[PDB]
């Protein structure tokens, strides 16, 4: 969807082309959802070793 967003700004979307492109803000918070899927997994495989 960033590949969607970058290509469509290269289209200059039909009348809404911004001089922004300031991403998110919850999409930056969506990036923290990935590491909180990773920090959840490192402790539950830590219980798996024993």
């Amino acid at each position: 969807y960033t590949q969607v967003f970058q290509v469509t700004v290269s289209l200059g979307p039909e009348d809404w082309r911004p001089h922004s492109w300031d991403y998110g803000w919850s999409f930056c918070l969506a990036w923290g959802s990935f590491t909180c899927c990773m920090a959840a997994s490192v402790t539950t495989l830590n219980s798996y070793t024993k």
Partner: peptide, 29 residues
């Protein structure tokens, strides 16, 4: 960024290989 996102498919396609070789080892278990 556009040259770098098509190469994610060989990453995730390898990630699908990570379980299929592992799950048959559970059949080896």
């Amino acid at each position: 960024l556009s040259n770098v996102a098509g190469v994610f498919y060989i990453l995730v396609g390898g990630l699908g290989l990570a379980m299929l070789v592992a799950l048959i080892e559970f059949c080896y278990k």
